[PDB]
Each structure stands twice: as C-alpha cells, then as structure tokens.
Design an enzyme around this catalytic site. Structure first.
Site, PDB file in Angstrom:
ATOM      1  N   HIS A  20      -7.836   2.485   5.025  1.00  0.00           N
ATOM      2  CA  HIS A  20      -9.527   2.548   5.410  1.00  0.00           C
ATOM      3  C   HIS A  20      -9.909   1.974   6.051  1.00  0.00           C
ATOM      4  O   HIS A  20      -9.892   0.241   6.156  1.00  0.00           O
ATOM      5  CB  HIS A  20     -10.650   3.997   4.787  1.00  0.00           C
ATOM      6  N   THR A  71      12.395  45.331   0.120  1.00  0.00           N
ATOM      7  CA  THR A  71      12.942  44.829   1.379  1.00  0.00           C
ATOM      8  C   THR A  71      13.373  43.403   1.307  1.00  0.00           C
ATOM      9  O   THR A  71      14.659  43.420   1.897  1.00  0.00           O
ATOM     10  CB  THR A  71      11.771  44.105   2.658  1.00  0.00           C
ATOM     11  N   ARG A 117      -7.763  -4.814  -6.406  1.00  0.00           N
ATOM     12  CA  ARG A 117      -8.064  -3.845  -8.113  1.00  0.00           C
ATOM     13  C   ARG A 117      -7.279  -2.593  -8.028  1.00  0.00           C
ATOM     14  O   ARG A 117      -7.314  -1.988  -7.246  1.00  0.00           O
ATOM     15  CB  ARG A 117      -9.663  -2.907  -7.565  1.00  0.00           C
ATOM     16  N   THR A 175       0.400  -1.326  -0.194  1.00  0.00           N
ATOM     17  CA  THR A 175       0.019   0.060  -0.075  1.00  0.00           C
ATOM     18  C   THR A 175       0.896   1.371   0.166  1.00  0.00           C
ATOM     19  O   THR A 175       1.565   1.523   0.288  1.00  0.00           O
ATOM     20  CB  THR A 175      -1.065   0.434   1.104  1.00  0.00           C
ATOM     21  N   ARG A 176       0.309   2.431  -0.069  1.00  0.00           N
ATOM     22  CA  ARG A 176       0.943   3.100  -0.603  1.00  0.00           C
ATOM     23  C   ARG A 176       0.157   4.667  -0.296  1.00  0.00           C
ATOM     24  O   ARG A 176       0.130   6.162  -0.973  1.00  0.00           O
ATOM     25  CB  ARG A 176       1.341   3.696  -2.022  1.00  0.00           C
ATOM     26  N   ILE A 199       8.904  44.077  -8.108  1.00  0.00           N
ATOM     27  CA  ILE A 199       8.249  44.159  -9.715  1.00  0.00           C
ATOM     28  C   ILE A 199       7.845  43.237 -10.640  1.00  0.00           C
ATOM     29  O   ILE A 199       7.082  43.478 -11.114  1.00  0.00           O
ATOM     30  CB  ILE A 199       9.388  44.713 -10.966  1.00  0.00           C
ATOM     31  N   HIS A 250     -10.069  -1.551   3.268  1.00  0.00           N
ATOM     32  CA  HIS A 250      -9.046  -2.288   3.694  1.00  0.00           C
ATOM     33  C   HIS A 250      -8.684  -3.015   4.444  1.00  0.00           C
ATOM     34  O   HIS A 250      -7.589  -4.579   4.856  1.00  0.00           O
ATOM     35  CB  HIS A 250      -7.364  -1.498   3.735  1.00  0.00           C
TER      36      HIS A 250
HETATM   37  N1  LIG Z   1     -11.187  -0.947  -2.207  1.00  0.00           N
HETATM   38  C1  LIG Z   1     -10.591  -1.917  -2.511  1.00  0.00           C
HETATM   39  N2  LIG Z   1     -11.118  -3.091  -2.757  1.00  0.00           N
HETATM   40  C2  LIG Z   1     -10.409  -3.852  -3.088  1.00  0.00           C
HETATM   41  N3  LIG Z   1      -8.714  -3.885  -3.661  1.00  0.00           N
HETATM   42  C3  LIG Z   1      -8.491  -2.307  -2.293  1.00  0.00           C
HETATM   43  C4  LIG Z   1      -9.118  -1.783  -2.186  1.00  0.00           C
HETATM   44  N4  LIG Z   1      -8.637  -0.398  -2.099  1.00  0.00           N
HETATM   45  C5  LIG Z   1      -7.241  -1.181  -2.664  1.00  0.00           C
HETATM   46  N5  LIG Z   1      -7.431  -2.006  -3.314  1.00  0.00           N
HETATM   47  C6  LIG Z   1      -6.318  -3.291  -3.284  1.00  0.00           C
HETATM   48  O1  LIG Z   1      -5.049  -2.746  -1.667  1.00  0.00           O
HETATM   49  C7  LIG Z   1      -4.021  -2.154  -2.155  1.00  0.00           C
HETATM   50  C8  LIG Z   1      -3.929  -0.816  -1.344  1.00  0.00           C
HETATM   51  O2  LIG Z   1      -3.490  -0.502  -3.023  1.00  0.00           O
HETATM   52  P1  LIG Z   1      -3.197   1.649  -2.623  1.00  0.00           P
HETATM   53  O3  LIG Z   1      -2.383   2.312  -1.544  1.00  0.00           O
HETATM   54  O4  LIG Z   1      -4.473   2.179  -2.900  1.00  0.00           O
HETATM   55  O5  LIG Z   1      -2.208   1.555  -4.229  1.00  0.00           O
HETATM   56  S1  LIG Z   1      -1.150   0.651  -4.508  1.00  0.00           S
HETATM   57  O6  LIG Z   1      -0.080   1.264  -5.286  1.00  0.00           O
HETATM   58  O7  LIG Z   1      -0.673   0.199  -3.324  1.00  0.00           O
HETATM   59  O8  LIG Z   1      -1.904  -0.364  -5.186  1.00  0.00           O
HETATM   60  C9  LIG Z   1      -3.388  -3.146  -3.875  1.00  0.00           C
HETATM   61  O9  LIG Z   1      -3.932  -4.568  -3.407  1.00  0.00           O
HETATM   62  C10 LIG Z   1      -4.578  -2.745  -3.789  1.00  0.00           C
HETATM   63  O10 LIG Z   1      -5.429  -3.019  -5.286  1.00  0.00           O
HETATM   64  N1  LIG Z   2      17.819  48.872 -13.265  1.00  0.00           N
HETATM   65  C1  LIG Z   2      16.225  48.942 -12.526  1.00  0.00           C
HETATM   66  N2  LIG Z   2      14.713  49.215 -12.958  1.00  0.00           N
HETATM   67  C2  LIG Z   2      13.981  48.215 -11.669  1.00  0.00           C
HETATM   68  N3  LIG Z   2      13.900  48.701 -10.590  1.00  0.00           N
HETATM   69  C3  LIG Z   2      15.256  49.721 -10.265  1.00  0.00           C
HETATM   70  C4  LIG Z   2      16.832  49.225 -11.260  1.00  0.00           C
HETATM   71  N4  LIG Z   2      17.715  50.184 -10.418  1.00  0.00           N
HETATM   72  C5  LIG Z   2      17.468  49.978  -9.137  1.00  0.00           C
HETATM   73  N5  LIG Z   2      15.513  49.636  -8.637  1.00  0.00           N
HETATM   74  C6  LIG Z   2      15.018  50.095  -7.282  1.00  0.00           C
HETATM   75  O1  LIG Z   2      14.576  48.940  -6.978  1.00  0.00           O
HETATM   76  C7  LIG Z   2      13.742  48.007  -7.084  1.00  0.00           C
HETATM   77  C8  LIG Z   2      13.301  47.059  -7.962  1.00  0.00           C
HETATM   78  O2  LIG Z   2      13.736  46.221  -7.514  1.00  0.00           O
HETATM   79  P1  LIG Z   2      12.632  44.680  -7.828  1.00  0.00           P
HETATM   80  O3  LIG Z   2      11.513  45.181  -7.349  1.00  0.00           O
HETATM   81  O4  LIG Z   2      13.317  43.329  -6.867  1.00  0.00           O
HETATM   82  O5  LIG Z   2      12.719  44.444  -9.105  1.00  0.00           O
HETATM   83  S1  LIG Z   2      13.142  42.825  -9.943  1.00  0.00           S
HETATM   84  O6  LIG Z   2      13.297  43.242 -11.648  1.00  0.00           O
HETATM   85  O7  LIG Z   2      13.867  41.958  -9.591  1.00  0.00           O
HETATM   86  O8  LIG Z   2      11.390  41.996  -9.783  1.00  0.00           O
HETATM   87  C9  LIG Z   2      12.591  49.305  -7.152  1.00  0.00           C
HETATM   88  O9  LIG Z   2      13.356  50.062  -4.800  1.00  0.00           O
HETATM   89  C10 LIG Z   2      13.330  50.351  -7.780  1.00  0.00           C
HETATM   90  O10 LIG Z   2      13.435  51.583  -7.592  1.00  0.00           O
END
Ligand SMILES: Nc1ncnc2c1ncn2[C@@H]1O[C@H](COP(=O)(O)OS(=O)(=O)O)[C@@H](O)[C@H]1O
Ligand SMILES: Nc1ncnc2c1ncn2[C@@H]1O[C@H](COP(=O)(O)OS(=O)(=O)O)[C@@H](O)[C@H]1O
Ligand SMILES: Nc1ncnc2c1ncn2[C@@H]1O[C@H](COP(=O)(O)OS(=O)(=O)O)[C@@H](O)[C@H]1O
Ligand SMILES: Nc1ncnc2c1ncn2[C@@H]1O[C@H](COP(=O)(O)OS(=O)(=O)O)[C@@H](O)[C@H]1O
Lengths: 572, 572
Positions: free
Chosen positions: A202, A434, A291, A197-198, A476, A205
C-alpha cells in the site's frame, strides 16, 4: 551487487551443469524421496545459492549450531534450521543410512531434481527447536507445522543438482541469485535496497522504499515471497498482480520486481537475519527491516509472539557479520493535515495520524465500502477487490441435515427457486438422492460409507463455493463427524451454514409416501437411519427448523433472513 | 531459439572479454576515429553478433559481393552494405593505410569502443550503390544519406571489442542476441515470431502478431527499431511508451518486448532479407513480413519506391538460405459489420472495410478529433496525443522582419500583450534590441555577424517552440539567407510565420526619435541597414503589413486571424 554470504555463491545448479546427463541417469537408479511443498522451497533456494554457504539439507552438526547458536558449524551466521524430514517407515522401506544416495523428486511433475548424499539421520528434539528457534508458543505457525507436518527424523546431507524446479507462473519475474546479479549488472546498478514482503503493497510501503532509495542512494528491488507465507494471506497471484499495478508509481527505471521462492516460517527476529542473508546472496547491498518484520501477529490469548522492532535488534546483534546494510524503519503513517507519510518517531505527539488496520480493510472489502486513496493506490485496491469480493457476490453453502423425509428435500428445492428469484448467483442443488445417484451411486450405508459420501458433497460444494455459487445440499448426514468435515472444507472457500431440519421421526415416518420406512420396519432394509442406524443430533447448527411446526415457505424465509443479515443479498 | 546465420554467432564482445584491460590500454594509443550515429548503430550490431557472420565493417571483397550479389565473399546471404566511411583529410591526418589499427570512439561519452584493423581503404561508386542496393531514386532517404552524409572512402576491416556502447534509455528492454537467447530460454520458449516495426502499433498490428502466433504455434517478440528510422517518424521514446501500453492486450506471458538498436536504411526488399538475418541472429524462429516492409513510401512525383509485397518476394528468393521462417501477411483491415480484422485476400469484394491512413491520423491528432477504438487502443492513442498535440497547444514562432524603426518592435510588444490576453501559452518576446543585448552583445553588423545573430535567434526560438511557447522575434533580418535558415530550424519543432513589416524606408527614417538614422546619414554609423548595408526584401512572407497604412492594432489583428485560421487559438 554484493558478495555472497560466506564468500562463495553455492550455485549447485551452475556447478553441476556439466554433469547433468550423468547425474540424471544416476538419479533414475537410486531410491527416490518425494518432497513436500516446503522442502521444495528449501531445495530450490539451496540449489541456486540463495542459502549460501549452506549446500544441502542441514546435518546435525550444522543443525545444532543453529538450533542454538545462530551459526553453522563453519562459524558463519545462519538463524534458520533447514532440514529434510522423514518417517521411520520411509527410512526403512528405502533402506536409508549414512553414505546413501537418494534422489529428491518434484511431486508436481515427478521430475528428478537433486541427489542428496546422507551424512546422518538424526531424531531432533522438536521441543527445543520450537522453543529456541520460534519462541515457544504452540499457536505459532512454524511450531504447529513442526509438530503436525514435520516427520520424526531429519536427514542431513550435501546436494548435487539434477534439474532446476519447473514453474509455470511468472517465469520472467522469477530470478536466481545468479540471474538477478546479472540483471543488476545489465541495468548498471550498484547499490540495491531489497524490500521483503508477503502482502499487497500500500501507500505506506511505496514510501518506505522510496525513502530508503533516497537515503541510501540506491535502486529498489521489490522482492516478494511467492513460495509459502503466513497461513491465511492473500494468494501470490493476487499479490504479484498488485505489485505490478504499483510499479508505475516509481520514477521510470528505479525499481525492479523479482519474485523469491522462499517458504517463510514467520520466525520474526531469526527469520529477519535469515532474510538479510538471502538478499545478500541475491546481490542486494541493503535490506529493509521495519515493524514486526516476519512476525505472525499475536496468539489466541492476544499476546503477540515477538515485539515490534525486536527483529531490528536481532539483525543488529550481527551488524558486523551480515555483509549487507539494514535500513530500519519505525511504523510509517499517514499525516492527513500535511498529506504525507513518515515514521511515527517524527509526528509531534499532537499531530493527527490515520491508519487502516488489517481488520478494517477486510471489513471494507467484505462490505464493498470505499478504501481511501491516501491508504492504497486505486489500481491496487481494484485488484484486491477482484480477489476478496463483497458478501454480495461471495458463494456460500447451505447444508441441510435431518431424517429421511423430514422435509429437508422440499425445503432445499424451494430455497433453490427462491434464490433463483433473488438473482445474484448460479444455484447448484444437491438433494440427498441426487448426490447418491450422481456422485455416490456405489457407496453403502455403513458409518464409513456415509462419511465418505458427505466428504464427496463437501469436495464439490467447496469448488462451487469458490466459484461464487450458492450451493444447497440436503443429505441425511447422520454423523457430526462428517458434518464438521463438510463445514471445514467449505469454510476454506466461503461461508457454510448448517440448517438442522429437526422434524421428529414420528412425523417423518408417518408421512412417508414411498413405504421406505415401511420396508425398514419390516426389516427389508437393514441399518436404516432412525430405525437401526443412529442420527447424531446437531449440537450447534446455524438454524433449527421443523416441518411439523413451520411450513416450507417460512423455513425458506428464515434461511433467507440469515443470508440477508450477513450481507449476501445486498446489491452487487 | 534458432542457430545464428552462418553457424557462428559473432559476439565480438563475449570473444574479447578476457582481453578487455589490454585492448583498452592499446586503444588509448592508436589514432582514434569518432563515429557518426549511424556508424554507431552498425558497430553495436556488429560487436554483439546481430550482423553475424559479418564481424567488422565491410572490406571491398565483401562489399562488392553485396553491392551486387546479395552475398558476402564467403557465400552467405547478406543484402545490405555495412561500411565505415571517411574523408581524404582524416585518412591523411591519421595516416590510415592497410594494416593500421584505429580506435572507434563514441561521440556521446567519448568512450573507446572497438579497435578496427584496416584491410583496405577503397573509394566506392556511390551511383552503383544508390542504384543496385536502394533502387535508384535520388529522393530515397538512403540515397540522400549516401550522397550528403556518407564521406568519400570506405575503410574495411575486422573488429576487436573494447567496450559495449552505453545507453541510458530503456536498458532493461535492450537485448543483445546473447541476452535475448538466454531470455527465450529462461521463459522456456522454442518457437518465436519476431515483429519488426518503426511505428506505433495499432489494432491491426496486434492482430497480425496474434495471428502469426496462433498459426505458427509461437510466442511473440515485439522487436521495434530504436536506432535510426525513416526521417520524420514518431520518436522512439513515444513509440516505446506506446508498445508498452499495448502489451496488456496479449494474453499473460505471450509476448515479450525487446528493443533493437538498428539503423534502418528503408531499403525495402533488401532491408527485409537483412531483417530476417538479424532476427535469426537474435534467435527468432519466425519473422513477419507484411505490406511494404521497410519501404519509405513514395517519391515526390508520387511514384512509390518499391511495390507492396516486393519485399515478401525477395525474402522468398532465398527461402532455402535464410534459416528463419517468414510469415507473410497482406494488408490487414477492419471489417465493421463483423468487427474483425483480416488480410484483404479474405474480404468478399462486397464487404465493407475501414481504414485510417497516416494522413487521416495526423489530421485528427492535429485537430484533436476522435480516433476510433477499432483502429487503435485507447491507451495508445492517449500516448500519441501527448506527443503530437493539437494546434491548440503547439508552440509557434512569429518572425518579424523590416527596417529599423518600421514599427516591427511596437507590433511585437502588442502581439505579445494580445496573446497573453488570449491565454493558451507562455509568450517569449525577442525584440531585436533585446536579442542584441541578451544574446548577441558582441556581434557586429557585417553580413556574417548578422547571419550569426539570426541563427542565434533561431536556436532559441526552436527550443521554445518545442516546449509549446509562442515566440515573437523582431530583428531587422536583412538577408533572405538568415531568414530561411531561421524558418528551417523552427520548422523542425513547429510552425514558423514570417511577417514582413514592409513600412517604407522614408517613413521609418522620418520618424526616428532616436537620431540613429541621423547619425548614419552623417556617417557616424557605418554600414547601417537602409543607408549603407542592404535589406533583401522578403519574397514569400506569410503576411505583409505596413505601419504607414495600417495601425499596430490591426496589424496585430491580421496576425491573430492567421493563427486562428490554422487552429492555434482553438480551445485546449
Ligand atoms: N506500516 C509499516 N511501517 C514500517 N515498516 C512496515 C510497515 N508495514 C510493513 N513494514 C515492514 O515492511 C515489510 C513488509 O512486511 P509484510 O509483507 O507486511 O510482512 S513480512 O512478514 O514480510 O514482514 C517488512 O520489513 C515489515 O517489517
Ligand atoms: N440404510 C439407509 N439409511 C438411510 N437412507 C437410506 C438407506 N438405504 C437407502 N436409503 C435411501 O438413500 C437416501 C439416503 O441417502 P443419504 O442422505 O446420502 O444418507 S447419508 O447417510 O449418506 O447422509 C434416501 O433416499 C434414503 O431413502
Ligand atoms: N496494415 C498492415 N497489414 C499488414 N502488414 C502490415 C500492416 N502495417 C504494417 N505491416 C507490416 O508490419 C511491420 C510494420 O511495419 P512499420 O513499422 O509500419 O514499418 S516498417 O518499416 O517496419 O515495415 C512490417 O512487416 C510491415 O510490412
Ligand atoms: N549597422 C547597423 N545597422 C542596423 N542597425 C544597427 C546598426 N548598428 C547598430 N544598429 C542597431 O542595432 C539594432 C539592429 O539590430 P538587429 O535587428 O540585430 O539587426 S540584424 O541585422 O542583426 O537583423 C537596432 O537597435 C539598430 O538601431
């Protein structure tokens, strides 16, 4: 327990334990390759026997026989390619070639884990893998990984073990095939149904598992994946906490919870054969397939990658070669009138059945709505709510973009005061200046430098959003590229809203009380947005306002109304 | 972890694992001795290394050096005699003598556990043991055992292991020194404070443990005894359930709960040295000793067997030889004004301290009264209440005795109807004749046969009392011996009340409508109570009534009033 697949449990860590010191020393000397998270899941299961008979990353001979015949060159069934990929640049830079000995390193703590001895270094047909192993859909998660993350070459080779991976989460619940086996012994168990199972478990199972236990006269091993799962599932810490809340619902000493460090591929049918092998290596005598086992749902055109029950067929094709008994189940549902659960193939076409889908659950989680006890136990639901809180307490980011002096900075401070009045959460205000002073004091205004800056805002905004804060940023942000980057990052953690303060350049320039536009105009400030540098107008913002036509107060009122319509201002 | 006491962990089960089949076979052939529960606790800890360096039941050389020097012949410290006692009749019947090989068998499932090779067979001075090991008080639990349960001879000898004891309760929480050590490893722990205990853990204890953890920079091992404890403590299933309710009160992954199959002696100071040895063998680096460690309180004349903190002194005498660090604590208490706990040696002689004694707790448990959260966590208290319910829901037995036809049978049926009206519990009515027909259809009326009969009533009455029923029995019960037997058995499970229906023989005889007294009088019925057989008048009954002077209705009213005064009729 049960015998390992192939007859020998490939516990490379137990094998090489006596040579640890030597291997360690030798490992300090070879060229090391650092593993990706998915290669680390694979390495862990290789080294501990989980992938027995496999005992290293697949070489082409082994690889090809799986890419197309679901078998390893030795004939044993094995449906999933397990390989170690690398790029041409690493292959060269490290001088990797057949017979070479590389060290595999843990990117988390830098530890030397294993020494691999290269058999080959081949370039695989990513298209045939895509198609033969994971169906062929380009939207499939495995395939997307195959193309965007997997490098170009696969480096095959047997492994020698240096150290077992370190894990700091749930060490008492993690088990190696060897440890689990010793545990089944300590408990005195002999027949064990394992449940894959993965997702959180429930009511339905809990019923499958008790049904399988009753029918195969077996003990239960809840064996969830904790490595890598489908792209957006609930994190494993939340899930483990949820599995633990469930345990008390089984009779005393009937189920055991053990975590599996698998990196799922969501390969449906193949992944199911694979899972049976793994559980057998871990010692389980039976394994549940229900299944849509290991299925990743449906693609964008709404077509679903595998059919329900296909994985039960596939695991059936090898009934005779997989040495572990599959216990099948059809969709299990809730019968309100009787207050019971059973597979659909047992509800009289006239009887009433209830079911809460994935979407309905997320809907309720997001809105705070009640989630029925017939659906999931109370303690489980509580845990799920702690992790996916309602919009009322989710963090969000309000991203403002516009020309310098467009009113965006006054709008930002008023929105901050307004939300502090409103009350739900901590408000972090990131005014362009910032941010520039606090985070980007040294960047310039080159396209690359601005883009870097907006990325820095997004990194901070995402962490605050994740902690449930209301983040207000107003740089920007001249380029759509940076803005989309911002939006993608925050979206990973919560809602992102882009408010375009479209106040016209003339207005901004004419009201600048700081003579900055002035200095730009007389060339004292080169490349100033609006005078020299461009301002890519936002195409699809969530809200467009104008300090020329509206007042700070109503722009603020318009933003608030949007947050309100989406439930962020509801009561907690 | 830490090194075993003596340097070698005496894991007899791991040692002899390769010879299991052979030892088993050889064990089917020797004369077997079946172990008592206390010898089975000792054997388990011997075989698994818990008592290292000891590796069998003590022979005299070892024994004597402990009976008086707290050392084993090899010089190692060891404060507690661990011996296997037998009676002359078994020693002869089995032909036990030096060099003999006996098999030790599990009385629970008949399994062959170990093969002991007799060194000697000595007759110990139970008085010197009594006095040198457990102080000297005849009221001391160990001493009482020493004299009433321990046989006459001690059979010394090394042990070879055939099978590990089987346990069906809490197998995942039970650990051998080897398993615990592997676990401390799996968890990656290095310093571990172990906490000994035979009681539920309350707030104060959670604090000692976190304090020790913080001060020694250690992880916590809650290591409770689950073998044999002081005569009337809370059963281990209730305690384990209580320790489990407590775990969530420690930060994630800080404490581990592991059960110890020790058979305590309550030897205060000596038992404390002993405990340090045991915990060291189990791998703990530190061990807590607090107030009155392993002490069994006070005797009847109110004098207490050991002083508080004496055990801390004793374990101190060997600071240099016990290879495990003792962490001392003085009585820990609750400071209301600050809402905190600390050892008394930290409360300013003027500050206010709160404390709930054993008696106060039992008082509240019995009455349903609230138990403060500063004292014990909510989930723990809940568990304690489920096991020691208030008088309102406890079962009880009303035992009626009197001459045949004294009105005791009519009083019994009316009391039954009355309590069914009252409502609290299931009422079981055991009228003399019903008991005779249903349980004693074949007994006669010989002193021995009547006594047997009354024992049979007591066996049934005790089980019903234990299940919270109201049992009403009304046999003749002529002999005080049987009645006291009855009272002792029921008292093990709940309250027993003796109501003497002292209706005079003349009255009974004159109103007999069944001509039974008649047939006795004409000798057709030999030995009839009152005519031939005697009727030992009850000396100290809880209530004396007379159907000659009172009516069934008021006798019933008098009984009810007694149950009421003691809280049995309160509301549940
Ligand atoms: N409702 C269900 N009825 C019958 N067999 C189920 C049911 N749900 C899951 N199984 C079976 O129980 C195991 C549970 O499998 P899962 O974890 O869902 O996914 S699987 O990739 O490991 O098969 C597998 O053998 C799957 O075929
Ligand atoms: N060449 C530039 N183009 C745009 N904003 C610039 C540039 N040089 C400085 N800044 C300043 O640096 C900030 C823009 O920064 P970012 O939003 O971080 O831009 S982005 O291109 O990397 O998205 C603003 O304060 C802007 O005034
Ligand atoms: N209130 C307390 N303050 C300090 N130490 C205590 C307190 N209560 C118990 N202890 C100590 O903690 C452990 C708990 O012991 P108990 O289970 O009550 O009985 S014992 O027989 O195991 O000692 C022992 O080390 C005891 O000395
Ligand atoms: N020898 C006897 N003494 C007394 N009661 C007797 C005797 N033989 C038969 N009974 C009948 O058996 C019942 C007495 O049984 P109990 O009460 O079971 O006596 S007791 O001695 O064992 O307490 C009454 O029905 C009584 O009439």
């Amino acid at each position: 327990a049960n015998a390992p697949h192939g007859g020998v449990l490939k516990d490379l860590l137990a094998r090489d334990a006596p040579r640890q010191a030597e291997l360690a020393a030798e490992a300090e000397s070879l060229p090391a390759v650092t593993l990706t998270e998915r290669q680390l899941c694979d390495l862990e299961l290789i080294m501990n026997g989980g992938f027995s008979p496999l005992e290293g990353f697949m070489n082409q001979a082994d690889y090809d026989r799986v890419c197309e015949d679901n078998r390893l060159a030795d004939g044993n069934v094995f449906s999933m390619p397990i390989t170690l990929d690398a790029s041409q640049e690493v292959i060269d830079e490290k001088k990797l070639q057949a017979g070479s000995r590389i060290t595999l390193r843990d990117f988390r703590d830098d530890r030397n884990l294993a020494i691999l001895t290269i058999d080959d270094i081949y370039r695989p047909d990513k298209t045939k893998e895509a198609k033969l192993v994971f169906g062929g859909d380009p939207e499939h998660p495995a395939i997307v990984y195959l193309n965007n993350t997997v490098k170009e070459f696969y480096i095959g080779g047997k492994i020698e073990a240096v150290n077992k991976l370190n894990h700091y989460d749930y060490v008492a619940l993690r088990y190696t095939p060897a440890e689990l086996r010793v545990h089944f012994d300590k408990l005195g168990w002999s027949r064990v149904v394992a449940f894959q199972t993965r997702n959180p478990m429930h009511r339905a199972h809990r019923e499958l598992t008790v049904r399988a236990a009753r029918s195969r006269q077996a003990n239960v091993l809840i064996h969830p994946v904790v490595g890598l799962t489908k792209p957006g599932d609930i994190d494993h810490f939340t899930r483990v906490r949820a599995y633990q809340a469930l345990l008390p619902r089984y009779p005393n000493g009937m189920a055991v919870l053990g975590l599996l460090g698998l990196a799922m591929r969501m390969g449906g049918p193949r992944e199911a054969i694979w899972h049976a092998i793994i559980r057998k290596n871990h010692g389980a005598t039976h394994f549940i397939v229900g299944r849509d086992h290991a299925g990743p749902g449906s693609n964008s055109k709404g077509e679903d990658f595998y059919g329900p029950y296909d994985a039960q067929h596939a695991v059936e094709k090898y009934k005779d070669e997989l040495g572990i008994e599959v216990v099948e189940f059809q969709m299990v549902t809730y019968l309100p009138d009787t207050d019971e659960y059973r597979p659909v193939d047992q509800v009289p076409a006239g009887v009433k059945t209830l079911n809460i889908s994935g979407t309905e659950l997320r809907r309720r989680l997001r809105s705070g709505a009640h989630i029925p006890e017939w659906f999931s136990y109370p303690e489980v639901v509580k845990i799920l709510r702690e992790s996916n809180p309602p919009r009322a307490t989710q963090g969000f980011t309000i991203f403002l973009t516009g020309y310098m002096n467009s009113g965006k900075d006054a709008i930002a401070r008023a929105l901050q005061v307004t939300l502090n009045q409103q009350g739900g959460r901590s408000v972090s205000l990131l005014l362009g200046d910032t941010v520039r002073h606090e985070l980007s004091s040294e960047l310039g205004f080159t396209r690359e430098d601005r883009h870097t800056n907006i990325q820095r805002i997004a990194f901070v905004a995402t962490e605050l959003t994740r902690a449930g804060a209301a983040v207000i940023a107003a740089p920007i942000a001249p380029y759509e590229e940076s803005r989309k980057f911002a939006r993608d990052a925050v979206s990973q953690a919560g809602s992102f809203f882009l408010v375009h303060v479209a106040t016209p350049l003339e207005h901004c320039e004419q009201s600048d009380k700081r003579g900055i536009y002035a200095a730009a105009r007389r060339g004292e400030i080169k490349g100033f947005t609006g005078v020299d540098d461009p301002y890519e107008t936002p195409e699809k913002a969530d809200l467009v306002v104008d300090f020329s036509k509206q007042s700070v107060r109503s722009i603020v009122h318009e933003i608030i109304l949007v947050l309100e319509s989406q439930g962020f201002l509801e009561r907690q």
